[PDB]
């Protein structure tokens, strides 16, 4: 049912904007590129915002990723720099209803 993809998951630059899509949901969700580190999730306390689906869902917006950024879990505790060149970078989204899963993609 629910599906989450991003146009341009491979051969990505740095401050490049990617087109994210979502279908089979509805409500308010969250997005942002994270990377399982020190056993924590370091995400960019930026490009990370919120969005809402329509009477249907799948909403469509743009998101700019980065090759390297300062680590920072959802909690708010900084972690450290993250190199999407070595660290498993990706973009997840969801809420308390459903995670929605995430997506990786090389980087370069």
Curated annotation (Swiss-Prot):
One of its GO terms (molecular function) is DNA binding. GO terms for biological process: defense response to bacterium. Keywords: Antibiotic, Antimicrobial, Disulfide bond, DNA-binding, Signal. Disulfide bonds join 34-43, 84-89. Binds non-covalently to a chromophore which is the cytotoxic and mutagenic component of the antibiotic. The chromophore binds to DNA as a weak intercalator and causes single- and double-strand breaks. Belongs to the neocarzinostatin family. This is Actinoxanthin. The lineage of its organism: Bacteria, Bacillati, Actinomycetota, Actinomycetes, Kitasatosporales. The chain holds residues 34 to 143 of 143 of the full protein.
